[PDB]
């Protein structure tokens, strides 16, 4: 799916999940890492 | 409150035929992926398959993909599985469920399962 | 097809414990992984998506972590409801596919 910079496909949920939820991960999503 | 309903399935004989409904209500079934998954007697989460919005995208587990039929019907709110040629293997409790992320959330929804004896 | 390995069918803890579920994914699946929770004769429940994040409801003593291969459900504070069995799930590749279900038990 096409998500913005700032958020990442999930697609379990079939969802563009904002980065924020993952930032405080070990490892959030590479496309994460500008924002993050 | 959301409900999803299961109704549809019970006793049949092996080589038979059962169609599995899950109605759902309170939330927007159409805007959701649907899923399917069972746990028979003995074993653990069986993942059956999924299907979008409109129907256009369906997956299946491999071994069922040529025995179980999913559908929905947006337009009743209800999705559907279809089960034929069932053997022993099949007497499981059927779950359907929505996964989904909205309104800023990541919901699950579940149906109160279903029942499935195959059997003489 | 993707085998999620919970190497632990049972796992013995006490109330008020932290509890560590492992699962081992056969090949890599980055951070599409899921857990969920069973109780008998109960729907199973979604616990966390992307490997991390809960599900809306979920408690915060339900924690995920894990990236590439190795994953861990943990729950700190073990709650008596707490005591079910749990399921590990990759969704990097179709078909999704299941672990085979860790069910925690009480030390006596």
């Known amino acids: 799916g096409q998500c913005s910079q700032n958020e990442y496909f999930d697609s379990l949920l079939h969802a563009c999940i904002p980065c924020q939820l993952r930032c405080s991960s070990n490892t959030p999503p590479l496309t994460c890492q500008r924002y993050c | 409150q959301v409900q999803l309903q299961q109704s549809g399935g019970g006793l049949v004989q092996p080589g038979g035929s059962l169609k599995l409904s899950c109605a759902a209500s309170?939330?927007?079934?159409?805007?959701?992926?649907m899923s399917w998954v069972r746990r028979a007697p003995g074993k653990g989460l069986e993942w059956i398959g999924e299907?979008?919005?409109?129907?256009?995208?369906?997956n299946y587990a491999p071994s069922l993909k040529d025995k179980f039929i999913i559908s929905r019907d947006n337009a009743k709110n209800t999705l559907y599985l279809q089960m034929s040629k069932v053997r022993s293997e099949d007497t499981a409790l059927y779950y359907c469920?929505?996964?989904?992320?909205?309104?800023?959330?990541?919901?699950?929804?579940w149906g109160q399962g279903t029942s499935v004896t195959v059997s003489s | 097809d993707i085998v999620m390995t919970q190497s632990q069918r049972f796992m013995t803890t006490s109330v008020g414990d932290r509890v560590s579920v492992t699962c081992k994914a056969s090949?890599?699946?980055?951070?599409?992984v899921a857990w969920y929770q069973q109780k008998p004769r109960q729907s199973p429940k979604a616990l966390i998506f992307?490997?991390?994040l809960r599900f809306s409801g979920v408690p915060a003593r339900f924690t995920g972590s894990g990236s590439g291969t190795d994953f861990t459900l943990t729950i700190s504070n073990l709650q008596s409801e707490d005591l079910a069995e749990y399921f590990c799930?990759?969704?990097?590749?179709?078909?999704?596919?299941f672990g085979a279900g860790t069910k925690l038990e009480l030390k006596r």
């Open positions: 992307s490997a991390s």
């Open positions: 090949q890599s699946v980055d951070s599409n």
């Open positions: 299907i979008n919005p409109d129907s256009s995208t369906i």
């Open positions: 469920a929505s996964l989904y992320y909205d309104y800023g959330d990541a919901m699950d929804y």
């Open positions: 309170g939330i927007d079934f159409s805007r959701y992926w």
């Open positions: 799930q990759q969704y990097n590749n179709y078909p999704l596919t």
